[PDB]
Amino acid sequence: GLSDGEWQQVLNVWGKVEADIAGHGQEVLIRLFTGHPETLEKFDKFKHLKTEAEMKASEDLKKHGTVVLTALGGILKKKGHHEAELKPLAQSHATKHKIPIKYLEFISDAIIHVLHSKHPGDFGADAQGAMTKALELFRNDIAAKYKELGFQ
Ligand code: COH
């Protein structure tokens, strides 16, 4: 688990995301799609996006970024007491969307990257550590659900 100090860092960082949820959301998704094009193929509604200019100009991609980060923010604010919130997410992503756990690693790394990119010099070593732990926790709790399902 994360310490009290660590959770506070996590939710302090998250303050940055909340000031522009859609912008953070869109950049996370573009980072994931451009770095890992296989991920784009899991989204029938975004596989028409051939170029980053197209991604950037997509209002629906931004809308989805908002849905994504809002769901993640909800989970983070539970400070690890997220079973009710995380279970349905785990299950829709395995069973419906067929998302390998690797893709959840990719988006975790994309969040850390976007935070440095939007907030250079304002995402300290301690904040990065805390946020990384929170994201691993999220990822690991999802992985336990995936194992239950025998997915991947
Ligand atoms: C590589 C693709 C992948 C990743 C890493 C990912 C990672 C994450 C993630 C990690 C931070 C969070 C909090 C969410 C949260 C959500 N995702 Co995804 N999702 C992904 C692919 C999808 C797909 C595909 C859908 C359906 C999109 C649609 O057509 O509306 C989706 C839908 C959702 C929805 C709508 C409800 C539902 O269908 O469950 C939420 C909320 N999610 N997702």
UniProtKB/Swiss-Prot annotation:
Catalytic activity field: Fe(III)-heme b-[protein] + nitric oxide + H2O = Fe(II)-heme b-[protein] + nitrite + 2 H(+); H2O2 + AH2 = A + 2 H2O
Entry EC no(s): 1.7.-.-, 1.11.1.-
Residues where O2 binds: H64
Any GO BP annotation: oxygen transport
GO cellular component assignments: sarcoplasm
Keywords, comma-separated and alphabetical: Cytoplasm, Heme, Iron, Metal-binding, Muscle protein, Oxidoreductase, Oxygen transport, Phosphoprotein, Transport
Record PTM Phosphoserine, positions in chain: S3
GO molecular-function terms, A-Z: heme binding; metal ion binding; nitrite reductase activity; oxygen binding; oxygen carrier activity; peroxidase activity
A matching Pfam family: Globin
Residue ranges constituting the Globin domain according to the UniProt record: 1-147
Subcellular location: Cytoplasm, Sarcoplasm
InterPro entries: Globin, Globin-like_sf, Myoglobin
Source superkingdom: Eukaryota
Binding sites annotated in the UniProt record for heme b: H93
TM spans (from-to): none
Residues reported in the UniProt entry to bind nitrite: H64
Subunit structure: Monomeric.
Family: Belongs to the globin family.
Record's function text: Monomeric heme protein which primary function is to store oxygen and facilitate its diffusion within muscle tissues. Reversibly binds oxygen through a pentacoordinated heme iron and enables its timely and efficient release as needed during periods of heightened demand. Depending on the oxidative conditions of tissues and cells, and in addition to its ability to bind oxygen, it also has a nitrite reductase activity whereby it regulates the production of bioactive nitric oxide.
Protein name: Myoglobin
Organism for this UniProt entry: Equus caballus (Horse)
Organism taxonomic ancestry: Eukaryota, Metazoa, Chordata, Craniata, Vertebrata
Designated gene of the protein: MB
